[PDB]
């Protein structure tokens, strides 16, 4: 329970840390590009050197295309992690396409939150 001693430093997993993408875009606006560098630096400082990147699309489109879309999104994020020190092999890339939503696609808001890469840290 050593986590209680933690003051205000290094809390880089807040609401801002979401990795979202514009409609049909697979490349990181420099806002998120930075968000990622922060994150990737944050992971390295705690001796984690390996993650899995899972890309998703929203609803619009045929699955095949969105699958391919999602994978690209993931790989765009992977490059940042590469440029931040993480061995590329230690960076698994997966594309889940429109199959696994986190939000209501019946809503514009939701759809934005669905076009995301999700950083998972494996044990």
């Amino acid at each position: 329970e050593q986590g209680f001693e933690l003051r205000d430093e290094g809390w880089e997993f807040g609401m801002s840390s979401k990795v979202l993408f514009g409609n049909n875009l697979d490349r990181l606006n420099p806002d998120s590009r930075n968000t990622l560098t922060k994150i990737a630096r944050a992971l390295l400082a705690v001796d984690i050197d390996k993650v899995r990147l899972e890309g998703h699309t929203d609803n619009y489109g045929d699955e095949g295309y969105n699958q391919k879309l999602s994978e690209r999104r993931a790989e765009s994020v992977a490059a940042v992690f590469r440029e931040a020190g993480m061995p590329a092999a230690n960076i698994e890339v997966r594309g889940l396409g429109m199959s696994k939503p986190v939000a209501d696609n019946k809503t514009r808001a939701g759809r934005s939150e669905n076009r995301r890469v999700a950083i998972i840290v494996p044990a």
Partner: protein, 153 residues
């Protein structure tokens, strides 16, 4: 290998660690822990716990089809659920600052922040940071040391 007994108490300890790296924006006086759905190793937590920081953990078992889970629980330890159930529960929580942790570690692509791997010589977990970022609770990155501290012999 190990015993269900032992492993239960282990889930207790690894949970309690994770809590220490988490911050509720409006920190309650008693942490409310909801065990939801089928569980193998929540017997320990169901006995109740107390944090290192004074706060007691009040833990009850709760029903998958309860809508108000999000206001009833600060900490949800999620049991075995199919995809539909899992969706319902996370609609229950959507919005409210609620930490979330699974007993099994196969379901970590959407949903819980932490997913446990409990069989085997040490307890670990996978962490989903989108899930974390979405949570609405503040979780510090150094918590990730709890998963590899035991994945290292």
């Amino acid at each position: 290998r190990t015993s269900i007994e032992q492993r239960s108490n282990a889930v207790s300890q690894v949970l309690l660690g994770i809590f220490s790296y988490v911050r509720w924006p409006k920190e309650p006086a008693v942490l409310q822990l909801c065990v939801v759905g089928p569980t193998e190793y929540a017997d320990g937590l169901l006995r109740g716990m107390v944090q290192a920081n004074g706060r007691r953990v009040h833990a009850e078992r709760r029903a998958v089809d309860n809508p108000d889970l999000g206001t009833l629980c600060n900490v949800i330890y999620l049991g075995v659920v199919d995809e539909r159930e899992r969706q319902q529960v996370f609609r229950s929580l959507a919005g409210h600052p609620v930490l979330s942790i699974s007993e099994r570690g196969t379901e970590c692509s959407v949903g819980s922040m932490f997913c446990l791997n409990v069989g085997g010589p040490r307890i670990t977990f996978e962490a989903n940071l989108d899930s974390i970022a979405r949570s609405g609770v503040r979780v510090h990155p150094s918590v990730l040391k709890l998963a590899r501290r035991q994945a290292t012999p």
